Design a protein around this ligand. Structure first.
Ligand SMILES: CC(C)[C@H](C(=O)O)[C@@H](O)C(=O)O
Ligand SMILES: CC(C)[C@H](C(=O)O)[C@@H](O)C(=O)O
Ligand SMILES: CC(C)[C@H](C(=O)O)[C@@H](O)C(=O)O
Ligand SMILES: CC(C)[C@H](C(=O)O)[C@@H](O)C(=O)O
Ligand SMILES: [Mg+2]
Ligand SMILES: [Mg+2]
Ligand SMILES: [Mg+2]
Ligand SMILES: [Mg+2]
Lengths: 335, 335, 336, 336
């Protein structure tokens, strides 16, 4: 079985996670899933109580858990999710941007961004050098570039066998140059391979998103391209994520805390529920138990039906229903 | 009068610049413009002849000139345009993304990106630290952040008095934090002001580009957002640029060398010609002579008519005509 | 008036500081000095009792104070001294290396002043692990800082033998050390007898002929090393003061450590602390403009030299058989 | 067999190197050493004639060579020596500071070896202007490099008095200097008599009691400074050799400069160059496995010590009245 650290987060995190809990419990029962969810404290409110956004007590629980499942965190998000990615070396950030039926703005969209998740500018090596002068250290390593490119190969083998490596090695000759070279060395000759500058990737996503299968890129570039790709697919409200390392993993929506709609019962739970889908997939592949696959298919079929029918969709995906209405619709289709 | 260093560049640069020359000469004559164009050597081919992509001889001419007007450069572009931005402190990169009539994909679009053009990761402070380990120094300074925010204020005063500062200060607390703080200090209270993380900017550009007036941001973020905004407006083939410093300025398309269509007479000259339009505007504001304004209006009216009529457009903007056909159409409407 | 945070510190720190108070009081009495000494806690003992080497209340008093006067700190010395240097931009570290009369010493009488940039170089702790087994540190050299320290070197040299050597390694560090050297040049050339020396050559040349040097101006790390070398050469390391001068704040301390070995035996030599009180009084003249701090510093320094010159009431480390207390009385008697 | 790029250099470099060739030949003859010496150009004179301090042809020969044997270089010393160090990862800098018989010297007989990490710290020149008046440099400390240098310190100490001091400033540079010290610990503890000393305390303690030290292991900058200090203390700076050891390549040179002052007068002391030939022969034993390089190095070193011991044919800098040429003949006669 699995122990899952469940972090609710801030803004819409609590309402989306707590309402979605009814579906997690229904899957546990219907498919006899040996998964224990333990709620753990992290984020902006947590920082007010403990003085730390990610306190020792929470770390103690997470260290014990197998996996982390979380809603968005607010202003302290770097002290929560970035700290976790670093400390557990959750080096592969997998973000599928996939259209659901009965949405546009771009028709059929299915793009996977594979984002390097541990280096680049994300380790906080920043300093005030002098009055009004600041510096940050960007870090690119062969080790980290090679392993992310390996993840991109594995993913692309399961899709259309096509990968574009996105970087800016024309300007960043040494750092991005090493990244591209490492990617080239793992990928070229095993999949259809190409390279594209990040600025031209941003434009090409808009011009022709159906030209893209797998995108492999660095931390900050992946942050940016995954948001763009997510919106293109139709909404950040439908965009899930897996942060996968060697020993642990973390599952979460791409979207933020959305403080301006918090408490209003219109947040889309789909990104979170799809992240649960990716969690269950991995539970299957680790356990060798088909029940997690059955629960994953029930979940996804349910969401896909709700979208296909199109009566209980939140405003962000073109509907007029509440988070509650959406959750009940999905729940009744399970399972 | 003005002396203009004219750099043709690589890929489609030569054909677009040399064909456009007929319009530059026609404006000089029709409006009695005292502008001398001097052709100077820069880029990939230039590097083969001299050993330097931007040789001393070219620098000698540029130092003498008032302004630089250029086509795209290929693989050595960082040794050409980045070297020029740095050495002349051309600190404001102004990129208007504006729809022309009779294009979509997004209807009416009019967004100005104001991109800081001298620091961030663009100064090439990169090193191999150790076997397989590389580092780059990102630089953000108050001085540079303040002056770009001043340019964004001036531009926004001429438009809808609305500015969004785009950064990633949730993760880059010190560098991006200083950037945002400097922007806040110049802008807030003088224009409608807000702040947005770069990832959410990328998504919001797609979701609702008409919500944006002026975007002020750092070097790399601006590189990325200006390409996305340009495509949204309809094509990188229509996206001009001004690089403005205290003593000199440089005008150029946002797009690259486009080697795969070089020599095929289908490149869109509009981005370059619109960059000439921005050059002439500035000549007016420096000289106090209305003739440059008359030439600028003739040029823009001509291009706008060609687009509005819609018979002589290149493939990138939905037509089927050649670069030649487009140039002759614009030329005959001048002036 | 001035307020002075008086830090007793660790090891011999408390005995030296507290036994010297009677000299502080004498000076205030004889020269009508409006100085208030407020006791502030810092160091290893403070950390054990309060949980911090510099607890909140200590920082509170330090803020209000104009100057800090301290004894040695133990294992938390870096935590205390460095934080204070950076917090209050105490940019000039003044390290005199001067023989006293007539002490046994291998090199004869040496008189050298190291002027050490005290806020940048590698002391800002801008360090990280960037990868498994790879660390990096950021050395910072600025024009403003290098210019400031050279101006200080100018004033000290003019007061001495008009001779400054700028010490660096700009043959290898072309940009950082090159900016330091250039800033020293621009301040010093044409106003003093100026020269430059590579740091490795300086270390050899101090040994070879220490009598050739007057003032050395250099960076944070090079200065840490050359101060101690010059100090040992002069035979004065256990005896010599130091000053860390900032615009709004200054810190004065002996260069010697806590010497836990001899704590409690009533023999610690108070000379270094007392000369650092001498440097404090010099800085009080400058900020206040008044002559009484000068007369006081000269009285103090005269008294000290005379007890070393007569030989009858010295502690054992400088060739005597008296207690700290007996040495202090003798010094105290010669004041006013 | 070995190929040695023989660099004559500048100032006294050419006279010392070329007059020593007859000793190179003697050694090859007497001990059947398959060594080929190929003359390679580098330095100030080379730059003036060819446009580069290390021209293409020089780099071509250096590549093919197993070892570099050089005299001093002038103003281009950093351009030459540093490039070579980084290019060929000559990671161990061996700097002996040893008195010779029986030279006048202030501190008596000293025998100290500095083992200096020779490829990282601040010597990679990772420096820039980041803003008007603000420069930055990147100090790099790696586990691999620090471990390598400690292993070298182990072998040298075992050959000597089994005593190593690791010198650093980890109280201030907690991460870079902390990794260096930790790597030295992990190699050395339990195999030698190990201790650590702060770099400023080391500079003072070398002066105070140089007889206490056997081997010092430290970083690139600290080593540059302490080598020269220790060298002056021993009275051996003009006399002492150095080695820069890499896996595929090694460089041997005197520590003394070009001494343009005395070039052409037939008096330059060839001892430093000749002992660096001694260190070259030690390294040739290790790579080849054969004993003849050892017998040769001992013959050389015996010959040198004996001419210093008899006093009749020494150059003027070490208290004699002979020419370089006369000193070389005397040395040459005692070989084989
Ligand atoms: C909230 C923020 C720290 C995070 C990131 O920057 O990675 C978010 O934007 C994401 O994409 O997961
Ligand atoms: C060609 C490249 C150096 C340049 C940049 O990165 O700025 C280009 O992408 C641009 O946007 O002007
Ligand atoms: C204790 C240490 C941090 C301090 C320094 O490095 O300056 C000391 O060595 C000194 O010389 O004041
Ligand atoms: C000349 C210089 C680059 C070199 C060094 O700094 O190591 C020299 O001082 C030395 O000790 O070999
Ligand atoms: Mg994001
Ligand atoms: Mg671009
Ligand atoms: Mg010190
Ligand atoms: Mg040296």
């Amino acid at each position: 079985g699995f122990v899952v650290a469940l972090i609710q987060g801030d803004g819409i995190g609590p309402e989306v996670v707590s309402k979605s809990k009814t579906i997690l419990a229904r899957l546990n029962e219907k498919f006899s899933l040996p998964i224990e969810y333990i709620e753990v404290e992290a984020g902006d409110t947590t920082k007010n109580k403990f003085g730390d956004a990610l306190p020792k007590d929470s770390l103690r629980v997470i260290e014990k858990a197998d996996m982390i499942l979380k809603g968005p965190v607010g202003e302290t998000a770097a002290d929560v999710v970035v700290k976790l990615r670093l400390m557990y070396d959750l080096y592969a950030n997998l973000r599928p941007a996939k259209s659901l039926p009965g949405l546009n703005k771009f028709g059929d969209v299915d793009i996977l961004v594979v984002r390097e998740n541990t280096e680049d500018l994300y380790k906080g090596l920043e300093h005030v050098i002098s009055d009004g002068v600041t510096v940050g250290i960007k870090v690119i390593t062969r080790a980290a570039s090679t392993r992310i490119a390996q993840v991109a190969l594995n993913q692309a083998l399961r899709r259309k066998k096509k990968v574009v490596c996105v970087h800016k090695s024309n300007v960043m000759r040494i750092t991005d140059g090493l990244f591209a070279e490492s990617c080239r060395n793992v990928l070229k000759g095993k999949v259809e391979y190409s390279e594209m500058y990040v600025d031209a990737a941003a434009a090409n996503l808009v011009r022709n998103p159906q030209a893209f299968d797998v995108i492999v890129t660095e931390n900050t570039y992946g942050d940016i391209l995954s948001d763009e790709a997510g919106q293109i697919a139709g909404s950040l409200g439908i965009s899930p994520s897996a942060n996968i390392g060697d020993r642990k993993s973390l599952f979460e929506p791409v979207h933020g805390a959305a403080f301006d709609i918090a408490g209003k019962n219109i947040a889309n739970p789909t990104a979170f529920l799809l992240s649960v889908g990716m969690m269950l997939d991995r539970m299957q592949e680790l356990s060798g138990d088909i029940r997690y696959n059955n629960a994953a298919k029930s979940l996804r079929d349910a969401i896909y039906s709700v979208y296909s029918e199109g009566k209980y969709l939140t405003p962000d995906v073109g509907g007029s229903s509440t988070t509650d209405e959406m959750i009940s619709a999905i729940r009744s289709k399970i399972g």
